[PDB]
C-alpha cells in the first residue's frame, strides 16, 4: 500500500522525511499533497530524505507524498531562446508558456575520450587582454576568479554580446544573485540585441537551496541539446561558490558526514561532473562544441580555499582579477602574471599569434621593473625604454564597458604598439590615438581589414606600415 | 606527597619544602583518562574539568597560620607553546614564575631564564629596597629597548643606529651575558666548580654595569662568571 | 544463492543486505544489472566494491559509477573475487578504464582471456633481489648525474611546456628497443581532452604499440579514481612475474590518488587526520608503492609526477610520497629556451644511486667533477656579467670554456624528436657517456667549437660534426 | 675627494645588497612559519567540525 | 564452548568486534578461523573489541574466534639470533622454523628505582664524531634525530658492525621502512659478519598498522631476555615517527578524540612505556644492560614539533643530523651545537677524556 | 521593521528608508539558536542555513513599479576579518559602501565620509 504513496514524518529547513515510497528511484522527482515538488536524495532503510523544491511552509507532518516515476529532467528546444526560466524550466519573465516538445535528464554521461577532438577554433571575447594574453578556444572551459566588484559579470556580458555576428549560442546561469541585478543584465542584453540567441537561467538568493544546486545542471542540459545537433554553445556560471554552499547546506541538513570546511566528501565530484560535460566533439559526432566559463568568488584574494583550489585543479586555465589593479584604474584589471591558458596558441588566429609574443615579453619585463620606476634614472640605455614601452602597453590594454572590438582591429593596434609606432606618442594620448585609429581604419584601411578577415593572417608589411605612417601624419598630440 | 607534606604542616607546625618534578604530567594523565570516562573533548582535546581538577590540587598547597609550605614546581610546556591550555591555566596559581626559553639555551646562556617574561610579587620597593627595585627596572628597560631594536639590527645592521641606541645595545649585550651563571650541578658537564652569589653583590654588579664602568671589557668575559670581580679576572686572563 | 539486496542509497555509498552466512569478502566486486520492467524504471549497469561489514548481514560499498536510478530491493550479484582486469599481450596498444573494459573503439576483449585481481599482497621478503643495479636508459644526463635504479621510484618535476611528455615517450622507446620491456601509463585523475591529446601523441609517435594505457577521468566517482593505479600496477605485474622482463610504470599524478582516497574516507565517515587527510594515508601509499619492486625474475620501476599543494613540501601527502622516492628529475624552462633538450637540470636533479659503491669509482668521480664545474660556472655568472670576461682570471676563463662545452654535451637528439627536427636520434650507453665526459674534462677537445657539442650523442659524433663545420 | 666619492658610492651599493639578502633570508624563514601555522589551523578547524558533528 | 568460542559481528579497517568469549581476559591473544592472530582490546558488556594482527581481508562476519589463553607474547631465545622475523616472531627469511623454548609478554613493567645503577661503561660506536663529542654509555637512551636522507640508518649500521669484538647483542627494528632497504641492510650485515649476533625485526610500510605499532615492543621484549641474564643488548628503532603515525591511525579508527596534530592523548605514554625499559641493572640483578637508539624524522629541521619534543623529554640526549652539512659533503653531519649526551662523559675512557 | 516598511512601499507607492543598526547580529542569533535545534555545525560554527536566511531577508528590499525600499545597514566586522562567513555573505548583497573616518572629523570636516574608501556600483 506504500509502494507509490508516502507519508511525511518530519519537516524543517526545506528537508522532509517520508515513510513508504518503496519503489522510488534515487534522484526521482516526487510531488507533495499541496502541489510543491520534491527530489528524493537519501534512500534509507525505513525513510526517504526529500529535498523540497519550493515553499515548505504549507507542508505538515502526516501529509501524503506521491512519486512521479521520472528522473529529474528539464525541457529543451529552440523555444527557450530569448526567455528567462528557472532551473525547473518554468518561465519567470511573464511572457507565456514555453513550447518545448522534448526533455533530457539533468544528469547524463559526459562524452568519451574518443568522442572528442583537439581544440582548434578561437572564441573571440572582444577584450584585448583576454584575446591577446589568455586566449580561449571552443570546447575549452576557463575559470574566471576574483574578489567582489572586480568586473567578472562585465566580462561575461561583453563576451556574450560579442557573439552577435558568430554562429554561437549563449546560456547565462545566475546562481544566488540578486533578482535586481539579473533584471538589469537581461535589460542590457535586450538593449544590445544579444537576447536573440541567449537563454537565461536564474536562481536567486531567496530561492530554496536545491534550486541553486540544480541550476548549473539545467544549464548544461539545455546546452547539450544544441551541442549534439552540431552547433556551438557558450555557458557562463555566475557563481559556483554559491552552488557549493547550497550543496553543503543540503548535505548537512540530511546529516551526511562532513569534511573540510563542513563540505561533503563528494564536493569535488560535483564540480568535476559538471565541468567535464564541456567538450569539442569529433567529426564523427557532428563537430559540435560547448565551452564553459565558471566563476569563483574569493575573499580578500584568498585563492588557497577549498573550492577555489578544486575549481583551479579542474579547469584548463584561470583569469585573475585583482582588486588593487581595479582601484588603481587598470580595468578590466586582468593580472597577466597569474592568468594562464593551457590551450593557448592553438586558440588564436595566425596574426594574433604573430603579434602576441612581443606583447607578452614586454608586459612581463615591465611588471618586474614597475616597483623601481619612482626613483627615476636607473639605466637610461635600456630600463627607461622598457618602462615607457610597458606604460604604453598598459594604456593600450584598457577598455570600456559594452564595447567589444573585432579581432582584426585588435591585431592592428597590437602590431602598432609592438613595432614601436607608439614610442613617440605621449602616454596620456594613447586612448585617443587608438580611438581615432579605429575610425581611420574604417575610413581608409578597409583592404587590410578585409585581408585579415579572409586569410586570418597579417597583410603585407609595407602596406600597413604606410597606413600607420599616414594616420600618424594626421594625428595631433594634445 | 601533598598529604605527607600537609601532615607536617598541620600536626607539627613545621616549615616544609615541597618539590614537584613535573606537575604537567598530572594534567596529561587526566586528559588521557578523560576520553574513556565518556566526557566530550575540550578545545585541544583536554578534559572539560582541567581547570577544576588543577585548582583542587593547587589550592591545598598553601601556607596557613599553623605552618608554612613553600613549593617549587617544574611545569612542562608542550611544543614550546606557552598558549597551550595546561601551561596557561597554571599561571594564576603561582606567586613567582621563571620562564625558560629555547633560544637563550641555544645562545649558550644558562639557566636561560627569560628576563622579561619572569615575574614575582616580591619585586616591590618596600620589600626588596629602593636601590634593588631601581636597578631591576633599569635593567628591564634596557633589555626591552634592545628587543625593540632587533628588526633594525637584523636588516640594516648596527651602522644606522644613533649614538644613544648604540650605547643601549652595547650595555644590553653585557647585561644579557652577565645574567648567566655557572652552577655547582653543571660541573659534571663542563668541569667548572660553580659559584654562589649573594643578592647585594648582584645588585652592585648590575649597578656598576649600568653606569658604564666596564664598557671597555670584551663581552665574552661576562659569560658564566659569577661575581663582578671574576669578570675582570677573566678579561685579564684573556689578554685585555 | 549469493544474491544481495539494496537497502540504502546515499550518493556514491550503497548498502547491500545478503543472506546469513554468505557475505562477500572485503574488496569483492558486486554487479548490479537491471532492465527496466516498466516506464517508471531506468536500466542500471553498475559495479560496487565491498568496503565494510556493518553487521546484521549488511555490507557497505562504494560505487564505481553514477548511482542514479537505483531502487531499494534491487538484487546484487557477488562475483566472489576483487575487480579483475585482462592481462597479457592483448592489453598492448589498448586503452582501458578502472574496470578493465576497453575504452577505445577497437572492440572488447574476449571473455575467455586471463584476468587477475587488482588487490594483492606485496611480494615476500625472500622473493626480493639482494643487489642494487642500475637501469640503463640511454640518456646522458640521467645515466650520468641521476641514475635510475631497477625497481626504484623516480619523481618527475617541471613546469608546463618543458617536455615531460617527450621525455616519457623517449624513455618508453629506449627501454622497449634495448631491454625488450614494455610500459604502462596510468592516468589518475586526468583531464579528458588532455588524455585524448596524449593518446594521439602516443599514436603518431609510433610508441603506442608497446604500451598499455589506463585512464581514470576526473568525472568518475572517488572510488573509481582510487583504484585505477592498482589496475595499471596489476597489468605491469603480469609482465614482471610471467615473462621476467623490466617494465616501466607511469603515474599521471599520485596526489590525485591521495585526494581521491581522502574523499572516499570522508564519504565512509572516518575521522580525519593531520591537515585533513585520511587516517590510512600512509598505509594506502605503502600498499601501492611496495608492489613496485625488483624481484629475482624481473622488476618494475616507476616514474611519478607529484603535485605539491600550496608549494609546501612539509604537507603530509608530499612527505609520505617523498618517503618512497629514490631519485628526482627536474626540468627547467631556462634550458628549454636555451635550446638544450631534454632540459634536465643538472644540479637540482638528485639520485640515491650516485654513490661509488653502486656506479663505480670513475663514474662517481666524473659526475662529481662535472657538478663542481657547473657550480663554478653558475657562481661566475654575476662576475662575468658585471666585471666582464676580461676580468676573469686564467683559471676562470678555462673553467668557463670547459663548462660551456660540458653543458652543451648534456643535450641529446631523441628518437621521438625526429618529428620536430628530422634528426634520427641516438642511444648512448653509460660507459660511452662516462668516457666522453672524462675526455672533455681533460681538455682533449678544447679546440673544437662550442656549438658542435649540441644534440650530438657520442663523443665521436662531435668530432664528425666539427669536421663537417670545417 | 674624487676617490672618496667613488668609495662612498661603492660602499652604499654593497650595504644595500647585503640588506636585500638579509630580507630574503627573513622571508625564507617566515614562509616555513606560515606553512606550519596554516597546517595547524586547518587541523584545528576540521577537528572542531568533526567533534561538533559527533556530539549529536 | 561459548566461553572460549566467539562469533564476529563487524569487520573493517583492521578492527573487528565479536560476540561471546565470556572468559577472555584483557590483552589476550585470540585466533580466527583463517589462522590470523588478534588481540583483545576492549571487553564491553556484550561484545569484545579485537585488533587484527594481519591481513583482515580473509575475515568475514560470522567467522569463528577462539581463545588462546595467553597474554600477548613473543618467542625468545638464542635460536633467534641471525634470523629475520615479524613482530609476532614468525620467521620471514625463509630459512625454516625457529626452535625457541621460552616466551615473554609484550607489556612488562620497567625496572624500579632501586633496581638500577649509574651508567659507567662505554659503548664504542666506531664513529669519531660520536665517540669524541657525544659519548654513549651502556644502558643509555640516545635519540638520533634528523631530516630525510641525512645518514641516520648508516650510523646505526656502523654501530652494529663495530660490536663484533665486544660482548654485545644487537637488535635492529625497522618500522615502516621499504622492504628493499631492509633486504640490502641484511645483505650488508651478512657481508660484514654481523649476523652472528644480530636479530632483525621488520614491519614494512605495506603491513597493517597494528604490526607497526607492535614491532618496537616485540624488539624490546626480545632484548629483555638477554638483558635479565646478565648480558648487554643494543636495540635500534629505525623510526618512531612511523609507529606514532600508525598508532594515530589505529586510535582514529576507534573514534577516539585527537589532540594537537591529530595525535591521541596517550601518544607520550606510548613512547615512554617503551623507552623506560632500557636500563643499567644493579649488581643485585646480574648487572645486565640494554641500550636504545630511537630514530625520529623531522620536517624541514623543525625540532619544536610535537613528536620530537615528546621523545627529547624521555631520552638522555640527542644527536642532531643537519641537512645542509650533509649536502655540503660533511658526513656524518653531526651538529655539535644541538647534540648533547647527559649520561655521557662518565662513560668515556680516561684517554678520550684528556 | 521590514514588514512595517513594506506596507508604505506597496499600499502608498512611497520611497522609504530602512535602517538596520547591526545586520551581523541577525546571523549571530541564527547561529546561536541553530545548535539547540539539532543542526550540524557549519564551517566556523555558523548555521548551515546562513545564506538562505540572509537572502530571504535581503531580497524583500527591492524597487518595484509602485515604489521602492532602500536600506542603509551598519555592519560590524569581528576582528576586522573580512573572510568570516557572515560578513562574506552579507557583502554579496551590498551595492555601495560609506566609510566614516575619525581623521576627517578631527579636522572639522563633516559628515566625515572617506572619499577614497567609499565605493559604489
Ligand atoms: N572595463 C570596465 N571599465 C570600467 N568600469 C568597469 C569595467 N568593468 C567593470 N566595471 C565596473 O565595475 C563595477 C563592478 O563590476 P561587476 O558588476 O562586473 O563586478 P563583479 O565582479 O561581477 O561583482 P559583484 O557581482 O560581486 O557585484 C561596476 O560599477 C562596473 O561598471
Ligand atoms: N627533445 C626535444 N626536441 C625537440 N623539441 C622538443 C623536445 N622536448 C620538447 N620539445 C618541444 O616541446 C614541445 C612539447 O612539449 P611537451 O608537450 O612534451 O611538454 P609538457 O611539459 O608535457 O607539456 P604540457 O604540460 O602542455 O602537456 C614542442 O614544442 C616540442 O617541439
Ligand atoms: N658517511 C657517509 N659517507 C658517504 N655516504 C654516506 C654516509 N652516510 C650516509 N651516506 C649515504 O647517504 C645516503 C642516505 O643515508 P641513509 O640512508 O643512511 O639516511 P637516512 O636518513 O636513514 O635515509 P632515509 O630517510 O632514506 O631512510 C645513502 O646513499 C648512504 O649511502
Ligand atoms: Mg556579478
Ligand atoms: Mg605534455
Ligand atoms: Mg633510513
Overview of this structure, please?
This is part of a larger assembly, with 2 copies of chain A, 3 copies of chain B and 1 copy of chain D (56 residues). Chain A is of the alpha/beta class and 478 residues long. Chain A is built from 14 helices and 16 strands. Chain A has a domain at 74-350: 3-Layer(aba) Sandwich (Rossmann fold), CATH 3.40.50. Chain B contains 12 helices and 4 strands. Chain B has a two-stranded parallel sheet. Helices cover 96% and strands 0% of the residues of chain D. The longest helix of chain D has 54 residues, at 2-55. The relative contact order of chain D is 0.06. Chain D is mainly α and 56 residues long. Classes of the chains: A alpha/beta (478), B mainly alpha (240), D mainly alpha (56). Chains in contact: A-C, A-D, A-F, B-D, B-E, C-D, C-E, D-E, D-F. The B-E interface holds B 28, 31-32, 34-35, 40-41, 44-46, 76, 78-80, 102, 106, 188-189 and E 256-260, 265-266, 268-269, 304-306, 309, 313, 337-338, 345-346. One magnesium ion (MG) binds at residues 152-153 of chain A. One magnesium ion is lined by residues 152-153 of chain E. Chain C: Keywords: ATP synthesis, ATP-binding, Cell membrane, CF(1), Hydrogen ion transport, Ion transport, Membrane, Metal-binding, Nucleotide-binding, Translocase, Transport. Chain C: It comes from Bacillus sp. (strain PS3).
Briefly, what is this?
Chain A: It is an enzyme of class 7 (translocase). This is part of a larger assembly, with 2 copies of chain A, 3 copies of chain B and 1 copy of chain D (56 residues). Chain A is an alpha/beta fold.
Helix content of chain D: over 70%
**Beginning-to-end CA distance, first to last residue of chain A:** 87 Å
As for the CATH topology of one domain in chain A, it is Rossmann fold
Chemical compounds bound to the protein: adenosine-5'-triphosphate, magnesium ion
CATH superfamily of one domain in chain A: P-loop containing nucleotide triphosphate hydrolases
**What top-tier CATH class of one domain in chain A fits best?**
Alpha Beta
Structural class of chain D: mainly alpha
- Decide which structural class fits the backbone of chain A: alpha/beta
Number of helices of chain A: 14
Topology:
The structure is cut from a larger assembly and holds 2 copies of chain A, 3 copies of chain B and 1 copy of chain D (56 residues).
Chain A: E1 5-12, E2 15-20, E3 28-32, E4 37-43, E5 48-52, E6 64-71, E7 73-76, E8 84-85, E9 102-105, H1 128-133, E10 143-146, H2 152-161, E11 169-175, H3 179-191, E12 198-203, H4 209-227, E13 232-237, H5 241-253, H6 267-275, E14 289-297, H7 306-314, E15 317-321, H8 323-328, E16 340-341, H9 350-369, H10 383-397, H11 407-418, H12 430-444, H13 446-455, H14 461-474
Helix pairs in contact in A: 4-5, 6-7, 9-10, 9-11, 10-11, 12-13
Chain B: H1 2-11, E1 16-20, H2 24-37, H3 50-58, E2 69-73, H4 85-89, E3 96-97, H5 102-106, E4 119-120, H6 125-128, H7 130-148, H8 150-156, H9 163-178, H10 187-190, H11 199-210, H12 228-237
Parallel strand pairs in B: 1-2
Antiparallel strand pairs in B: 3-4
Helix pairs in contact in B: 7-9, 7-11
Chain D: H1 2-55
The structure holds adenosine-5'-triphosphate (ATP) (3 copies) and magnesium ion (MG) (3 copies).
One adenosine-5'-triphosphate binds at residues 160-166, 341-342, 414, 417, 420 of chain C.
